[model samples]
Target chain A: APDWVPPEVFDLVAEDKARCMSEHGTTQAQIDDVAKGNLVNEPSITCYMYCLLEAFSLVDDEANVDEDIMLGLLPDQLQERAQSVMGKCLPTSGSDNCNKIYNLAKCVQESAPDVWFVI
Target chain B: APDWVPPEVFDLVAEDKARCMSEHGTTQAQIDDVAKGNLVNEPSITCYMYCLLEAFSLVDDEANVDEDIMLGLLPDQLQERAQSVMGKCLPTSGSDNCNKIYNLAKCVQESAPDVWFVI
Candidate 1:
């Protein structure tokens, strides 16, 4: 039997997913799949994590971090650790705010090594 | 050092540029440079015009055109004509709305070959 995840979690995930889609040009289906544990593979996981972390950093004021910290972690942490790397390399520049959030996501993904296991 | 371009033209161009950036993840500076004739070679112009036409289609009801008409125009019309092409080839899918506008832009760019000369 499938365990029940709270509606609030789904709500939080849905809101974050919408924001991520608007900001990063992603989709709700992609985010939902990621949240539901469908994207367990390394590269997809990293990309998904980067997006999730970005959503958290945007919504959660406590992430107390900067852009460089986030971006550096992607190639350094996620790409290196994940067995199957997928998706194109992340873009370095364009919107200052977007880059900031993107980098913060990288930082979170890199720092929380155990997150991959849970996913 | 510079000649006067009408404020309305500038305004239309600026609004379109901003829309392009928001929708397609491009930049106003890139759009302006293209508008100013700095990117005359090939690929850059096609990409820039693709964005520009997308903007027109979004704001204009008269374009009355479909996406395929627009996307198909880039390689067939512009690339073959110019020598040096810069920038990446356009992506196929992401947002249906964005792809629709993007393709619309390509169609207009291809149909109106003289607009590039004026720009």
Candidate 2:
């Protein structure tokens, strides 16, 4: 329940973040959202999810999500929420990388706001 | 100089934004960044750039940038910065919409943060 959750508490790094920030604007947006007290917007949350998924190598090129890899980044007990989020949001429509990740993050943010994070 | 620049001051409606946000996580990220005063980051800039381009119909399916349409979205004086940003960052690498926009926004922010905005 601590870290390794949705939206927030990512095992993020300044280096990875900087790279992602340049490539995906979503990363930067999430940081700003948390800095302010703004309500969590879904697309921003989705992009944030995409950034981290790439950072952690959670999704394969085939778009088959490595659930183990995805959850491995999180703490032990917090895994369930992530699984729930993924189960709910994993796109079945042959979505691209960014989109699939967005669905993952959005579902988590909506279904389990507690585990969901922004910054 | 006032509005109609790279980043902010768009004729964006909540409805359009919501649709774009659903389709491309970039729109929401741009909104969140403006609420905070942190330094701009690139991919976030790119996605934000992509969001607006899609919203304004500036990029065609062939990845050709409609300079006229793009500049039309901006006011008269501020048009220069958008031009400069596109001139420098309009991807020659056949990048997708998201990547092209990221590159365009990144150039503007780096070349002239004054006109380059986030949110």
Candidate 3:
């Protein structure tokens, strides 16, 4: 509960992403790997994820996603955006359960590319 | 500015780690690897890292660690703890740059294993 991140927080995840990568000295290959596959066994990208989550307070130290917290963090206005993103990104149980973070971020990037690089 | 996490916050990270891992569905080997090398290229472990940072508010969306923010967030009481952890965990400039999060956490785990599973 202390570390739970709200949904609205994701609004800034994209901008913060650049910082994570840059600060970590990530390689282009690893970044590309993260884009294609959620898990690429690369440090530049994966380790960056480790810190990104903390930057936004999305997951816990043990690596679990608190949907309630995320949704709770969402604003009434962006609630739709949150659900829409989850709908497209979230996997039903027994799927890439491990990739919700990256999955969710990628989905938003598609739906709201503006969030990251959109003009 | 909106996404920077403070240092004192690390105090609550160990407890929250479980939530992040459980919510995400990580495997044991991955967790084991994160503790050791800081970069084992495992999903269960690496992806978990993605969410953990968010949960704790450690990394930014771009995945950068704002040292000023972290140090600012640190309390006077734990400043030494923070420094101690970083001393053992934080790498010198132009170093493993990628594994800082894992390395930092692992170092703390060694010094403060009780934080996570300290008996």
Candidate 4:
């Protein structure tokens, strides 16, 4: 993750990660790799992202992202850039829920690498 | 608490009020009455407020309220008025920690009754 991501974000993720991982059959290695920006299209990793986002109400069952919750979770300094990326990248599109999140991540990473994070 | 306050705020308070009450000898009735806008000068109730604020890092050891954290805690709709009240009431003045929070609450109540809440 970038230096700007708050420690509290990781702490929050840690609190929810175990259950999300368990539900999605995700391994810590895949989660860690994604945290390091090594995202793949694999469902174990991508569906885990979907599960985490849904758990936090960041997205809905149809994989539609909630802009307000997304912005609320971000630090003040990152909100503007994150919003910009959201504008460019949202209305998530893919064949399935996991793929939709993978596409969203890729879109965000391309638009603002520092603003998007897996953990 | 006004209609604008989010359900999450009450949920958050409920989680911490139990522990804060145990530490400060505060009763649930006192907390409930305060939530109903019936505040008193009692230290048990007042110090419980201080303890709750401190638990959330909304106040420091000196009972100085953190404006940024305070603003962040409030619903977005209340933030502007809350900041206005804060500007007028802050740099808390009282003989002790509990009294300081009491004074702060009183000031807030006077400025914006709907904006201030105990729960």
Candidate 5:
């Protein structure tokens, strides 16, 4: 019998598996199938966008939100406040960088759903 | 009995195969092995570089070469004449654009070595 591993460790394992699966042409369907039993964890693209949002929130909380930095959020998140920004802005379509950010979000969502909620 | 196929058709087949193989894990070793029989052919990186040079030469021969365009050549091929230009300018390492141009050159070279020389 295997000992219980902490959630963070499980999160790391889930992230690694998601990355590996990406390389092997694994799609959302495959991830869903695997999740049916034995913790079929798959990352959500939404979470990555949230992380970027959190970063902005941090800057705002410190009262050091540079106008230039805030303006640099692109077409999606250029608003003065995060609440006013579009969710699509955090990870818009047709942008490789945004796609990567979204993929990262998905990874975090699968590995740590609770943590995902905070972001 | 097999019917005689035109050389141009054969060239097309070769180019297609090379492109497909590049998508797979096929390397120089596999190309070499395949080349041992059935008119196996592969493209060369140097030939790809030469095409970029030829394009520049065409612009030069027209004598309408824009100073701005000519100067656009980076770290190579920016001299007054083509001969003075460095070969590396056409397809240098660490540049994705150059790599794609080089790949195209290789494809042309393998499929039509005679045409390659003319270019």
Candidate 6:
């Protein structure tokens, strides 16, 4: 029984990474953790997440996550699961855009389990 | 014509840094930026600052900055300047302890430009 089904991998732009790192003071190690499914409630990492997502147009400035873009971004097989998680997780939260994404990440991870991944 | 005045350095505990990094997904580069007065409103960096301050009892859970501890922590030459900045910056605003510290850092940096350094 292969419990480790393939997760949806989100490719971040390498070119944007350096600017984001310098802007937010994020390190490569912090970005690497997202691929490993390791997340924390910290601003540096959270803000980085928002930055990358915004660059891809996956989220708006107010931290409003775009489910349609995310749905279209994923494979057909995972879209259903992703939709479920988005349904449960969205409507974002609070005033802090980064923290909203933090909460969104946690909610999506907890809800979808093996359906999430970032690179 | 020396514009680079020696800043009041605050040494963070090395033992706790690894734990804080793990907890917040912070990186060494982010920490290093603080010493150079390079800062952003990102949570990873800001939260780490708060975490380091909390460990040393320089702040509380609610992010109420301990002016007394900070004053005591600085050298006599910096204490007066630190006090003045703290006077203008104290009574941390809004919720989010980390954000409060972020605001405090910016205020302190703007107020007593050369009197601050974090290690």
TM-score of 4: 0.48
**How do the residues B1-119 of candidate 5 rate in per-residue lDDT, one tens digit apiece?**
01222345345345544543432224545434322322232223222222233344422211122334544542242243432332323322321222333443344345432222211
Query: Candidate 2 on B70-96: residue-level lDDT in tens?
Result: 667665544643564566666434356
- How well does model 5 score by local distance difference test? 0.33
Q: Looking at model 4 chain B, report the run of 10 residues with the lowest lDDT sum.
A: B110-119
Q: Cα RMSD (Å) between model 5 and the true structure?
A: 20.8
For candidate 4, the iRMS in Å is: 20.4
Tens-digit lDDT track of model 2 for A59-102: 54323477778677667777777777777876422233334544
Best by TM-score: 4
Give the per-residue lDDT of model 4 (tens digit) for A1-119: 67888898788888678876765567878866765678888767777788788879898755789999999988999888888999999898874556778999999888576777776
Predicted candidate 5 versus true structure: per-residue lDDT over A1-119, tens digit per residue? 01112346345445544554454445555434322322232334223332334344523322222335544442221122222222323323324443443443344333121122211
Q: Is candidate 2 or candidate 4 better by DockQ?
A: 2
Candidate 3 off by > 4 Å = A1-23, A26-43, A91-100, A107-119, B1-119
Give the alpha-carbon lDDT of every model: 0.37, 0.52, 0.47, 0.79, 0.33, 0.69
Q: What fraction of the reference interface contacts is present in each model, in order?
A: 0.00, 0.00, 0.00, 0.00, 0.00, 0.00
lDDT of 3 at B53: 63
lDDT of 5 at A89: 35
Q: What count of clashes does model 4 give?
A: 0
* CA lDDT, candidate 5, residue A44: 41
- Each prediction's DockQ? 0.01, 0.03, 0.03, 0.01, 0.01, 0.01
Q: Candidate 6, residues B1-119: lDDT per residue as tens digits?
A: 01333342323466666655655557888767865778887666776777677877887645688888988777677777778888998887733555677888888788675665554
lDDT at residue B96 of model 5 (Cα atoms): 25
Clashing pairs in 1: A70-A103, A70-A107, A71-A103, B43-B85, B53-B105, B54-B105, B70-B107
